[PDB]
Amino acid sequence: FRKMAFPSGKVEGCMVQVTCGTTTLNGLWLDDVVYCPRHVICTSEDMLNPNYEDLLIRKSNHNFLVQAGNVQLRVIGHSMQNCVLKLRVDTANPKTPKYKFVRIQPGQTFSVLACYNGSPSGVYQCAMRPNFTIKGSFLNGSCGSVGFNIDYDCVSFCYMHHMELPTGVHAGTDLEGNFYGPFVDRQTAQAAGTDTTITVNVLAWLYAAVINGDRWFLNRFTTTLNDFNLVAMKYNYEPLTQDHVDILGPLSAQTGIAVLDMCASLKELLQNGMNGRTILGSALLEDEFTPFDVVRQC
Amino acid sequence: FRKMAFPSGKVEGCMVQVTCGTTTLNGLWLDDVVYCPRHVICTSEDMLNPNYEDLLIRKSNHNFLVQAGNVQLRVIGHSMQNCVLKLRVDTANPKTPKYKFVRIQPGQTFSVLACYNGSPSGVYQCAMRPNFTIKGSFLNGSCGSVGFNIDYDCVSFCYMHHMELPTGVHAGTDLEGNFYGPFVDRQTAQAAGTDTTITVNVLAWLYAAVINGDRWFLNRFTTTLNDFNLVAMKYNYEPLTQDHVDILGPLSAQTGIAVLDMCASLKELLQNGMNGRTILGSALLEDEFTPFDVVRQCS
Ligand SMILES: COc1cccc2[nH]c(C(=O)N[C@@H](CC(C)C)C(=O)N[C@@H](C[C@@H]3CCNC3=O)C(=O)c3nc4ccccc4s3)cc12
Ligand SMILES: COc1cccc2[nH]c(C(=O)N[C@@H](CC(C)C)C(=O)N[C@@H](C[C@@H]3CCNC3=O)C(=O)c3nc4ccccc4s3)cc12
């Protein structure tokens, strides 16, 4: 089991660059609209606390340079939606895939296509942390890179990149420009909440272990959901939701291990430790594999 | 800092499905040729001891069903180059990138595009182990998936996938059909040579960990090149060459830590352990990042 991104080609066909003055960020070109972070209109002096509405009233369609490679796409309209800019262009992207905009939940994973001046540079899988950061790899000029999942040739875009916190993790928005977590698009030092372990993903990891014959940790106990949640919080693990119980369903069916029985097994792991014994060859409990990831890799 | 793969679009547009009889695997469509593992011709009986030139001479052009998406491409010629079959089709692939076929060295990395039935499924980064295996993620039907590097719009193909060892590591060939390692395309349980750790990569990775603001493992000591190799070889690490020292220069210059200083650091980590602490979140020393990988990602 290793971290596996989705193939990036459908997304690559949509990466463009958007320039205002000398600031160039990445943008996403779908049909005749280009989506990009709104602070591309920011001057260096205007970033400590920008008045975006005032800054945008001064801009015109001809102030925006949108380029697919070195080819210019003429802007014919602009509007702001939360923290993203929506630039209407005169050409429908012929490489537009079937697509959706979705807001993901903590614990869900997605692939990030790291881009610079519109050129793709790399692809990797990320997990949204419970404190709404992602442990990404982003340099200067990466803003506007997107994160995504592909189900049956349809690309669900879920992330657009905006910021690196002082701790080195990263923060961004969905494709409607709404931040994940309590961050804002200002050149300020912001702190995320304390992070926690993604319980639903650890349980999926335990199911993967069982599937592969590693099952020493299975006990004869069960628990109620509420009892497990109260114990999980004491170990800085996320509480389980009903949605978490449901997405663990296929793995529970495949192994014949009830979700609450597996919760009692993890509960014993938290209270008593791993005893130098390993699970899937590891002494640490992995938490960035979703139940879909586990099913994908099997 | 994360295991990062090349964007896979240029390769995706080349992946097709190839069918002979009851067998289906993936092929690579470049210009007017499709490359795939030769044992797509093997029936279940053939697989234990296939006489490949004999099995292939008894196949005609119309025995091969090549599908590109929903379209079928017509095979108009075929030949075998070692463990790879080359099917000449009557249609050129317009999405053919600029490309080259290369044979990587152990310790080098590449991106794998895992495919099933000619459909791309996932992309992740692999390293050619010293024992010529790769720790990949491959299932039934993945044969014919390829590994590659990219360098300014030029795709350097280096690996085509052929098998999973009983230990779960993977084995395959370059695009000339020659295996990496002592393996052979027959249906048998095969063991690899004893693996060792890619030392130059571990060092590159500790530099990456310092560029990302983690330094707990550093120390005051230095070591000589030979004294480090003595300890390294004792722990089943590959020897470090002066070329490797040079290759690590840019990372040494950036962080101002001399290579043999970092070698002293690694030597202590090997003799004392990690004492339950982690480096870049990992509990184990990582050796699947080359010096080029860390530089490309960090700068
Ligand atoms: C004293 O202020 C701080 C104190 C402590 C930590 C801090 N972090 C940031 C911060 O992140 N700012 C945002 C920008 C804000 C407006 C969202 C930002 O630079 N995003 C980067 C991606 C960054 C850069 C390095 N790799 C990361 O992912 C990006 O691509 C963009 N470049 C520009 C250039 C010009 C105009 C717009 C953009 S948007 C500020 C900051
Ligand atoms: C007693 O024999 C064993 C004992 C102990 C461990 C073993 N491993 C293998 C072994 O790997 N076989 C080869 C096939 C050989 C001929 C190269 C193989 O590649 N199958 C897959 C990829 C595999 C499968 C699971 N994930 C891996 O990546 C593939 O795509 C192909 N399927 C077929 C099906 C029919 C014809 C050609 C191909 S080629 C045999 C074996």
Residue numbers in the entry:
A (entry chain A): 3 to 300
B (entry chain B): 3 to 301
Task: Quote the authors verbatim.
Main protease (M pro) serves as an indispensable factor in the life cycle of severe acute respiratory syndrome coronavirus 2 (SARS-CoV-2) as well as its constantly emerging variants and is therefore considered an attractive target for antiviral drug development. SARS-CoV-2 M pro is an indispensable enzyme in viral replication and transcription, and it is extremely critical for the cleavage of two polypeptide (pp1a and pp1ab) sequences after a glutamine residue. It has a unique feature of substrate recognition that is not shared by human proteases. Moreover, M pro is highly conserved in SARS-CoV-2, which also makes it possible to develop broad-spectrum coronavirus drugs [ 17‒ 19] .
YH-53 is a peptidomimetic inhibitor that effectively inhibits the action of M pro in SARS-CoV-2 in enzymatic and cellular antiviral assays [ 26‒ 29] . As a covalent inhibitor, YH-53 primarily utilizes the benzothiazole moiety as a warhead, and it is derived from a tetrapeptide inhibitor by the addition of a trifluoromethyl ketone fraction. In the present study, we determine the crystal structures of a benzothiazole-based inhibitor, YH-53, bound to M pro mutants from SARS-CoV-2 variants of concern (VOCs) or variants of interest (VOIs), including K90R (Beta, B.1.351), G15S (Lambda, C.37), Y54C (Delta, AY.4), M49I (Omicron, BA.5) and P132H (Omicron, B.1.1.529). The structures show that the benzothiazole group in YH-53 forms a C-S covalent bond with the sulfur atom of catalytic residue Cys145 in SARS-CoV-2 M pro mutants. Structural analysis reveals the key molecular determinants necessary for interaction and illustrates the binding mode of YH-53 to these mutant M pros. The results provided structural insights for understanding the precise inhibition mechanism of the inhibitor against different M pros and strongly indicated the potential of YH-53 to be developed as a broad-spectrum drug candidate.
